[PDB]
Amino acid sequence: KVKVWGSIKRL
Amino acid sequence: KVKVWGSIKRL
Amino acid sequence: KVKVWGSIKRL
Amino acid sequence: KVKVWGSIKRL
Amino acid sequence: KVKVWGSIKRL
Amino acid sequence: KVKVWGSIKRL
Amino acid sequence: KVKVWGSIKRL
Amino acid sequence: KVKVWGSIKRL
Numbered sequence A, B, C, D, E, F, G, H: 001k002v003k004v005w006g007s008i009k010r011l
């Protein structure tokens, strides 16, 4: 299991 | 742009 | 960019 | 078992 | 420096 | 109830 | 409850 | 220098 926290440029 | 957070089961 | 943390069973 | 803490450029 | 992630019952 | 996140300089 | 992470200069 | 990773019951 991996947790993620950030941003993406598009959905 | 979208702020994104959560979990992923595997890479 | 995404900050990532968690566990992996094997390399 | 291995634990990870860092960043990735894309999901 | 310390980072926090959680909940509080009141402001 | 309130979800809270951020940074604190010292305890 | 709050998840907490960071650094402290000395005990 | 010491690094910390855990939880606290209140801010």
Ligand SMILES: O=S(=O)(O)c1cc(S(=O)(=O)O)c2c(/N=N/c3ccccc3)c(O)ccc2c1
Pocket (backbone or CB within 6 Å): A005, A006, A007, B003, B004, B005
């Ligand atoms: O590492 S980043 O700089 O890319 C960064 C920065 C933020 S944040 O805006 O500064 O805190 C968020 C984030 N926060 N999102 C808000 C949700 C509700 C209200 C306001 C903000 C989020 O939910 C997920 C990922 C994030 C990644």
Ligand SMILES: O=S(=O)(O)c1cc(S(=O)(=O)O)c2c(/N=N/c3ccccc3)c(O)ccc2c1
Pocket (backbone or CB within 6 Å): A005, C003, C004, C005, D005, D006, D007, E003, E004, E005, F005, F006
């Ligand atoms: O070694 S790195 O410099 O690449 C580094 C730095 C951070 S951090 O932002 O400075 O603490 C994180 C991280 N933290 N993520 C936040 C989660 C919620 C709120 C704010 C931040 C995370 O969950 C996983 C990996 C990380 C790797």
Ligand SMILES: O=S(=O)(O)c1cc(S(=O)(=O)O)c2c(/N=N/c3ccccc3)c(O)ccc2c1
Pocket (backbone or CB within 6 Å): E005, E006, E007, F003, F004, F005
């Ligand atoms: O550890 S907890 O279970 O107490 C937990 C759970 C959440 S969350 O709702 O499931 O992701 C958050 C959180 N998220 N807040 C949202 C912001 C914008 C939209 C939706 C949600 C947040 O910004 C800060 C702390 C949180 C702590």
Ligand SMILES: O=S(=O)(O)c1cc(S(=O)(=O)O)c2c(/N=N/c3ccccc3)c(O)ccc2c1
Pocket (backbone or CB within 6 Å): A003, A004, A005, B005, B006, E005, G003, G004, G005, H005, H006, H007
């Ligand atoms: O050892 S503990 O079980 O007490 C534990 C567990 C978690 S965790 O939620 O399972 O990964 C965290 C943590 N993670 N916090 C999130 C930040 C952003 C999004 C989701 C979660 C954190 O930033 C600091 C300390 C933690 C300590």
